[PDB]
Design a protein around this ligand. Sequence first.
Ligand SMILES: OC[C@H]1O[C@H](O[C@H]2[C@H](O)[C@@H](O)[C@@H](O[C@H]3[C@H](O)[C@@H](O)[C@@H](O[C@H]4[C@H](O)[C@@H](O)[C@@H](O[C@H]5[C@H](O)[C@@H](O)[C@@H](O)O[C@@H]5CO)O[C@@H]4CO)O[C@@H]3CO)O[C@@H]2CO)[C@H](O)[C@@H](O)[C@@H]1O
Ligand SMILES: OC[C@H]1O[C@H](O[C@H]2[C@H](O)[C@@H](O)[C@@H](O[C@H]3[C@H](O)[C@@H](O)[C@@H](O[C@H]4[C@H](O)[C@@H](O)[C@@H](O)O[C@@H]4CO)O[C@@H]3CO)O[C@@H]2CO)[C@H](O)[C@@H](O)[C@@H]1O
Ligand SMILES: OC[C@H]1O[C@H](O[C@H]2[C@H](O)[C@@H](O)[C@@H](O[C@H]3[C@H](O)[C@@H](O)[C@@H](O[C@H]4[C@H](O)[C@@H](O)[C@@H](O)O[C@@H]4CO)O[C@@H]3CO)O[C@@H]2CO)[C@H](O)[C@@H](O)[C@@H]1O
Ligand SMILES: [Ca+2]
Ligand SMILES: [Ca+2]
Ligand SMILES: [Ca+2]
Length: 637
Amino acid sequence: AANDNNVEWNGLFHDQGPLFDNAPEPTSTQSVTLKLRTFKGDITSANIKYWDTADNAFHWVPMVWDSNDPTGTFDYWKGTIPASPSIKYYRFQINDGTSTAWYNGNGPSSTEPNADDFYIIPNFKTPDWLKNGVMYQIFPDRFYNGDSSNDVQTGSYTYNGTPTEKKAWGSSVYADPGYDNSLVFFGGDLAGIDQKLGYIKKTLGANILYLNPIFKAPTNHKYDTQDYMAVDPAFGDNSTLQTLINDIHSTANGPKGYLILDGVFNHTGDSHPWFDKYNNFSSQGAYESQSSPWYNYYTFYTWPDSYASFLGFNSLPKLNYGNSGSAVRGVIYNNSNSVAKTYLNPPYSVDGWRLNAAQYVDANGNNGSDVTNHQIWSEFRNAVKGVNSNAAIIGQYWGNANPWTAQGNQWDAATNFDGFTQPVSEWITGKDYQNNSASISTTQFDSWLRGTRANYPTNVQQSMMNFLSNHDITRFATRSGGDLWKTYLALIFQMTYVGTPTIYYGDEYGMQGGADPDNRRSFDWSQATPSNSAVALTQKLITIRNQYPALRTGSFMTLITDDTNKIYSYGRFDNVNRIAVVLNNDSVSHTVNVPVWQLSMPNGSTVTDKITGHSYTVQNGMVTVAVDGHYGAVLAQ
Ligand SMILES: OC[C@H]1O[C@H](O[C@H]2[C@H](O)[C@@H](O)[C@@H](O[C@H]3[C@H](O)[C@@H](O)[C@@H](O[C@H]4[C@H](O)[C@@H](O)[C@@H](O[C@H]5[C@H](O)[C@@H](O)[C@@H](O)O[C@@H]5CO)O[C@@H]4CO)O[C@@H]3CO)O[C@@H]2CO)[C@H](O)[C@@H](O)[C@@H]1O
Ligand SMILES: OC[C@H]1O[C@H](O[C@H]2[C@H](O)[C@@H](O)[C@@H](O[C@H]3[C@H](O)[C@@H](O)[C@@H](O[C@H]4[C@H](O)[C@@H](O)[C@@H](O)O[C@@H]4CO)O[C@@H]3CO)O[C@@H]2CO)[C@H](O)[C@@H](O)[C@@H]1O
Ligand SMILES: OC[C@H]1O[C@H](O[C@H]2[C@H](O)[C@@H](O)[C@@H](O[C@H]3[C@H](O)[C@@H](O)[C@@H](O[C@H]4[C@H](O)[C@@H](O)[C@@H](O)O[C@@H]4CO)O[C@@H]3CO)O[C@@H]2CO)[C@H](O)[C@@H](O)[C@@H]1O
Ligand SMILES: [Ca+2]
Ligand SMILES: [Ca+2]
Ligand SMILES: [Ca+2]
């Protein structure tokens, strides 16, 4: 490069990784020093332009040359944004004579952008254990029956007239005629999870467990809560939970663990005593009497038959949050004995909440995604963080969750359907998570990923729940057509991307399954051993991620987007490690020349592909590696 009236986009780079930001999660008194990379001698001047919410205006900070990288290929320019309590958004203006370029969250641009700027949210912190961990999601009744003395037998009880149906471990999910799918039980329980912690924390290596609803409810999924204060009998009792939590936090059975519970706070089940639609309690529920002490916990359009609910499901009456200080806000999160605080405080001390149907929470029966909804989650964060600043808050949302994350006053992260699950599905399987024809090329995949990461503050990005499948979508293995290699590729990307790798139980060995409830099959324990190819890769990958902090909190830079050979390469790097991930999304092998010079990997140095164990030497800024079809290489140094 040189001073030739031309800014070379390929040499430019910035993100909030260690090499470019000295304060990614600053307090009110900490200044933020940013570094912008360019090819050596490529420009004449650069400036940081930031919008300050404190005065609703732009501010200008000219940058100064700082240093060259070890390879002498790049320049690092720097500038500092002053410390203050206000949220700020920044972008860079880059000039080389008569040539000007702009750069922000969405990368380089010839014209000045007005969106996707980088974020500076003083005092906003997401749990670092979440940024650095690996999560394992378990649907209780389908993981492992550790105690058969609490199994829901056929005809054990009825819900809305229908009797429960038990099935042999491994048998089909769908309920035989005469029963309901929501009332099928296999026997999975807490005791089982406790007994299988070794498989979770050692065989695989995950250190975070996220469980679907475990509180008293008639169904098998239990999103229709009957009693938030009690573990459902089919899963055990509250003592069983305390023991499970102890064994999860214990370091005697593997690395320290964390437990995230599913918080179903937008609605209760219609069988909850506050509502009591079928009169299962001597008390008078809202549905039973307009004089009920909990009558105003719900919203009736036509008492008692027509009321606000989750997506029209009468079995899920919607909770009325009213105004600040309401009784409902109290039992959910404000009260010391609320659902949220009870489990976060001893003797439970869980580590987080996954917020079910979070966008809908509101007052008076409204549908959320409004001012009131956001005020509620703001108060929710204060309540939760007040009890435990290191308790995670992850909201369920299918699209861009920027509205509940980008102001640092609500959630720490969200279910990453739009930024991970969907794009990964369409690129690798040619299907969307619903299993409908939907394919994207490598260049599109990469663009999609950048655009979605840009929707969030960096600490939020690193905390996103990135799963291949989950209880509401079709199994990746099914969308893949039963092809294990596609799962191999998905796992490699998952374990080396930005955000919390989240493994939906069974996905580690390639468990198949269609749409609800076929996506909740029982777990096959004979297939959960390193003797399984996917399981073995999962354990190896988790070990790899755990070894390199760069994979969890390092920078992310695109290296290759080849639509011809279907090759995708990107680097993850920090002050210590430089890793070039090379993914082959084609059905045939390809020899790729990886431009590791972009990550500043010194010529003559070596890199090890941790997937195959093979070693390579960097020559002329390149690493030549032959990657099998639907496989990948993790070249690290
Ligand atoms: O005259 C009969 C009756 O018919 C109609 O009701 C039927 C529904 O239209 C039909 O869809 C079906 O409902 C099923 C549903 O299809 C099935 O998927 C299941 O849904 C559960 C989930 O399994 C459960 O996980 C939970 O969902 C969570 C979700 O997982 C979570 O991530 C987040 O999204 O929040 C959700 C809610 O907390 O709950 C849902 C709903 O319970 O089970 C459903 C059955 O309850 O079958 C219905 C009955 O046949 C009409 O609508 C009705 O008016 C008629 O009376
Ligand atoms: O201040 C007025 C000056 O304006 C003009 O200077 C320009 C240069 O032409 C640009 O190239 C640039 O200079 C940068 C340079 O691009 C950058 O690499 C870095 O240079 C380092 C170098 O990397 C390092 O290896 C070692 O050699 O030290 C160098 C100097 O620190 O930093 C330079 C900035 O100091 O921008 C300047 C300013 O716009 C003009 O050519 C000058 O005659 C004039 O004085
Ligand atoms: O919440 C949903 C929305 O989420 C996303 O919006 C983000 C932007 O992507 C971020 O860049 C930022 O926006 C800042 C902006 O960076 C800042 O400059 C200022 O906006 C200026 C604007 O630059 C200027 O051209 C002119 O229009 O004045 C504006 C001031 O009003 O302030 C913005 C914040 O208000 O944060 C938002 C919100 O997190 C997504 O891009 C949106 O599509 C989505 O609706
Ligand atoms: Ca130039
Ligand atoms: Ca059991
Ligand atoms: Ca009653």
